[PDB]
Amino acid sequence: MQEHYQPAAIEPAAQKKWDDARISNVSEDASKPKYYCLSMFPYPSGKLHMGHVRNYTIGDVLSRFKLLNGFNVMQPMGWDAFGMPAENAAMKNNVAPAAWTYDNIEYMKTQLKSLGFAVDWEREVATCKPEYYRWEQWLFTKLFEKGIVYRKNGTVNWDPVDQTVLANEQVIDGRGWRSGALIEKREIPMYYFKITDYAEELLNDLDKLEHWPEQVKTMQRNWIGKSRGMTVRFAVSDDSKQGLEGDYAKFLQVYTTRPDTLMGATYVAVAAEHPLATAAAADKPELQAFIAECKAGSVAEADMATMEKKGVPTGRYVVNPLNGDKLEVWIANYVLWGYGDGAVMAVPAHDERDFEFAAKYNLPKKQVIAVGDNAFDANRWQEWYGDKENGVLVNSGDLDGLDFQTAFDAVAAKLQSQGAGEPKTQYRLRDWGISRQRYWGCPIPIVHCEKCGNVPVPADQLPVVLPENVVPDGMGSPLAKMPEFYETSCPCCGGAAKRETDTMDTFIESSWYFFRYMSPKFSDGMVSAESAKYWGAVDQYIGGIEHAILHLLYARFFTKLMRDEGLVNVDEPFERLLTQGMVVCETYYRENDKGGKDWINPADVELSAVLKADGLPVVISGTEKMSKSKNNGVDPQELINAYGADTARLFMMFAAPPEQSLEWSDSGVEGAHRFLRRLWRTVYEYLKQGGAVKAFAGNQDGLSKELKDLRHKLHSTTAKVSDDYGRRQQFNTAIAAVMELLNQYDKTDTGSEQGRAVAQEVLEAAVRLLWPIVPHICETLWSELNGAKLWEAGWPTVDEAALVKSEIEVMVQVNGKLRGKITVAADASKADLEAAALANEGAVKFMEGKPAKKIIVVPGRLVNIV
Template sequence: MESQYSPDRIETKWQEYWDQQKTFRADQHSSKDKFYLLEMFPYPSGRIHMGHVRNYAIGDVVARFKRMQGYNVLHPMGWDAFGMPAENAAIEHGIHPAKWTYENIDNMRKQLQRIGLSYDWEREFATCDPAYYRWEQLIFLKMLERGLAYKKTSSVNWCEDCQTVLANEQVEDGRCWRCSQTVAQKQLEQWFFKITDYADELLEGTDKLSGWPERVLAMQRNWIGKSYGCEIIFPVADRKEQIKVFTTRPDTLFGATFMSLAPEHPLVDALVTNEQRSQVEAFISEVARQEKTDRVSGEVEKKGVFTGSYCINPADGRSLPVYLANFVLMDYGTGAVMAVPAHDQRDFEFARQYDLPVIVVIQPEGEELHAPSMTEAHAGSGVLVNSGAFDGLDNETAKDRIATFLAGQDSGRQTLNYRLRDWGVSRQRYWGTPIPVIYCDQCGTVPVPEQQLPVLLPTDVELTGAGGSPLARHQSFVKVDCPTCGKPARRETDTFDTFVESSWYFARYACPQHDEAPLDRDAVNYWLPVDQYIGGIEHAVMHLLYARFFTKVLRDLGLLDVDEPFTNLLTQGMVCKETQRCSEHGWLYPEQVIEGKCSTCGRTVEAGRTEKMSKSKKNVIDPNQLIDTYGADTARLFSLFAAPPEKDLEWNEQGVEGCARFLGRVWRAVSDSLDDLKQAGTMSESSSEAAMELRRKTHQTIKKVTEDIDGRFHFNTAIAAVMELVNAIYALPERRREATVLKEALEAVVRLLNPFVPHICEELWQALGHQQSVEASGWPSWNEEALKSDIINLVVQVNGKVRGKIQVAATAERTLIEQEALNEANVQRYIEGKQVRKVIVVAGRLVNVVVS
């Protein structure tokens, strides 16, 4: 064994070994208990970043740990390969999206393999493979048969200059990413999935997902947004239009003083007067630049614009001005809100901003509110005032009474509402799964026959950035015979939202080569649900909700028998680093800063905030450079040790170097002990106290690391515990004489570290004389007897303040403990000349001497 740790040599060696031996191949027919571990699969952008390293290292720890525990582990990897960046690259660099995508996949696969991740690469697939999206098209057709897929007119982002629909990601500051023209809202026919049919089941399911973070479950419950209330109709003054609102507070109806509409509301065009049109259009453009999450966050300034129209309050006939407001979304309720400033904080802030009336209609018990002096809305309970015949009612009773009153005059009704809206899956771009539908003038909308699947994405499409969908200009794709009547027809040229591909990929991993159906039911039922899923919280109400919906659809289509896709969910934190900026050259990469100065101009660099690593801020670390310098195991160890998985990790160069030094210490601990270990035999009663203490430390460490990893994911404290054990090994005197306990400790270190740093552990395990892989050696177990100590340490206090420590036998009598405490040298200083009133012994913890 070499005396120096050389990560480059051993990491290449063991990665080749794992590949040749198919070490991580999953076997459906194993007699072991299964464990399905999955991280959210990546988009093949071309290069991995430290966020990838951290995310996949976290998953790899769990996968390797479970294998060592004796589980049959499925740990697959693939590629979320469709999407807009490939089209951008095609337009910018003149390279076909497929070529760009597959080259990136090849590059990223090599990078992931270099980290030593224990994937079953035989299950790999990309979602842009026809062998994958063929089955997605079939699932769509089955959903179409059941009424779960349909087409309707919807509001979209529209660029008039490019004559195309834009995804939200393609809208930058309210302008088209291609031509920089202002984006408008337009009504177009779009395909939808009827996720609302599963709203109740999705909501009820959140109460059963005990292995999910409560924060994610709360976000999903809020997004589904089930609420009981009242639908109220507000006629528009001097027009035929009506505005429908949904409210959970009909008791506040008499306090409504204006109407707020979402800028995307379909009635906007009809309600805007000529005098207000320019202001309204400017406001809509401004709101289009805001993220939806920002608009409803409560932190953004409430802004709006008057449409010029009024609606009528059905309760008392008052005219209410109709405004557009930036905090109202079409995604929730009806896209219209009756504004009651006295009893809703958002409405209150808006009313104060635009000098609109505030009418108190609910007085809280024991108080008397006066609108002019109110500094915030009263959203609680109370008794109705200023509400006509309903004055004096408590507000809960008034909800039903007012709803009944509205129903009697055909102005409203009690109803159940969901915030959740059906999922719009149409995308007007090339690089996506073709929607398998044909339009015939005689037969209407015709599904593509199953035997004609997949509808292949043509490879000879020209991507120029010009307006319109590239597929719509590809005549050999568009023109097709109707499968029903045989007459000329045209194909659908929309492609699926890429969230469709990621909503069922985890099930396909169970049977990636199955070619008779989307899923092999036996294989899927064996592996699903995923036992541990790992990914970012930013997917809480998109991918994770869609995956739950798709799983229920696949169940109802008879393709699998599970209700939920993921039993346990871990949402990992981000990797962050300090930003650096030059006043002349802007943000700088770390390698552009030399001794605190810009390498280009020599100016002193300004240190900025610590933020999520991003190319835009240039505060990124290239994993390849990190591995070149320190090795993959060091990169893994730092990403796992620097912070708990669910917390953000702050990059620290000294921390990386510290991890590298620790692995060097582990290496030397083994290499320097090999001659001593030849003396190892069996543990004897004559072993020294130091040896017995090391054995105790070994078993304590095994217990702690096991508990820290298993379900708790306290990787940082688990690693710290192993570090302490390594220190104890170095402190052991007479190593040759204590070879038996030394060997046990060293082998424990190697096995406990294996999930974290597998390359060095495989090499050290072999050096310790084992022929099989360390992964095959199994997870170590602790001995309860070995955890017990013959000697215990006790703190000694004098009048409650720590003054010393003593060591006594675990079986020592109370009188002996008291005497040892009183005889401790430092304690003697504090009791000399004083009267000992009593000595309190807290078993196993401390002694308190009370003096006066």
């Protein structure tokens, strides 16, 4: 054994040993229990940084733990390859997105191999490859013919100067981000998943996920946004019907989640596009101007909660069907057309928004709900005004005194008897818009024929292949300019036709890749039946909280869709979810000649701080999440060249609990490295003093107290680490526990024959307990200690006999006079000592049937019965 730890030498040799043994290349082996551990696959956008590494190290720790416990572990990796990163790199470097992507994949794959993750690379997928995306095209066509996918007009941001559709993220102040031109709202045909048809299933099945973090479930419930409310119709007054047609001339319909407050409605509000709005604005130029301002605004929820709520009165009136009040209709900028009725009732006394709107325009506030003896002031909003759970109705006729639910059901019965309303369930969830006017994405398998319409591509003709010989330049999608792509024949009639040139939302690839990993070379379907039956669902999923809503909801939705197609037999894709904390790092910049800032990478600066290239100073700025945005991503390859993969992995796992943020630290890397040399030094010095022996096992009676204590520490440590990897998933405390075992080891004389056997037992356990964290050094150290294969020796077992301490002899006194002796456990409570002392032979004789006035218990010394 070499004296000094040399990771540059031992880490490649360990990886080759694992690769040759194929321990990470797994089949559907019925002779072993399966374990599927998945980390969220990365965008191949250039280089991974230590943040990504922390994510994948957490997954590798969990995978290697289960591997050591005899599981058949699948831990797959792949590339989430479509999307805007490559399209942007094409506009900057004039290179093809495919070429840029496959280049990044090659570099990133070596980054990962360098870290020694226990990954089944035979299951690698790259989602921009036809052999992958043909199957989401397949599912698209199957759902399109069921109407689950459908085509309909939708709104987009059209930039008239750049001649391109813009995402909302690039529309600032109503204008294009790179053009500054006024953005036009265009209606264009697009494709949608009818995810609203699955809202109830998606919501209710969250209750099955007993091992998900509750905040993620809460975020999904709030996003789906189910409500149980009431449709309510207000009859249009006789004087207010001019210009109104059909049902709009007869009533104004709204939806409310508080029908228990309908007796407190004091006005009604409608969207600018509502037919009552347009009819009252016929002769009113002020309402026309207000309607136009509304249409020229951002309907985004991000802007609307921060939006000043405004309105104008219409001079039209409707009638409350419960109390007969005549309420004026207002046009209001917060009521959105298309979200149900486009009209709402207002109850200022019990809704905070209505209260402020009514305080602005001095509109009436009518209390209809009281909470106990609480004081109600119409000139100040109090949180109890909206309390739905502890109120009763006041000022409500025969509804007075009821709670929320009873009033809700009573209002429903009364409204239904008059034909003026009925219960209704609504969801905030909207259908999922699939179409992207972008090149680097999965083509939509639709052919447009002037005779047949929108026709899906037959399954025998999939994939519709995206051409890779393309360099986009933002002047619109190049697919719409390539007739050798869009010119085709109709699959139904054979006539000339045109391929759809929009591509798919790239969330589609990540909505099912976890099933493709189960059979990534299967060419007859999305996933083979045998492999889906074997692997079931993902046992453990690890990824950032930024994907807790959309990505997870889409993945759950695709799972249910695939189940409904008979492709899988699980309802939910991920059984457990670990959301790792972000790795953060200080940033550095230099003022640009254009007045901007040149963000510099920490690996190219020196520290007052200077750039490592010229010696001129650079500015030290704030510490934030590692990302390419501020160029503060630490490349693991640089850490590995300087210290080794095990150091990188150990620092990430030790610096903080996995869910807590983790600050980059040169000092932390050095501490991790010193511990690895301590571990190496410990085993080297042990083997220098005599060589390897058979580890102690079996009956420890006759071992010295010092060695019994070390075995107690050993098996306590094994129990703790097993619980930290397996239940708590807290790796920093697992490493700290092994450090404590070594500290006790260092303080124990292990030179005797029995001492060397216990030493061997301790070291053989330490190196296996740490193998999930630092497998390279632990693999090498194991092989110097023991001849068996580490993965066949398995996870260390807890010797329960090593955990029992010795019994203690206690004196039994009666009124301070020694009357007997008792033997009790070291863990014996004060009540067990009292029990045992009272039953002592000499005690019961010298008590003379008299009861104990008091019993004094000195733990480990005596019991005095008075």
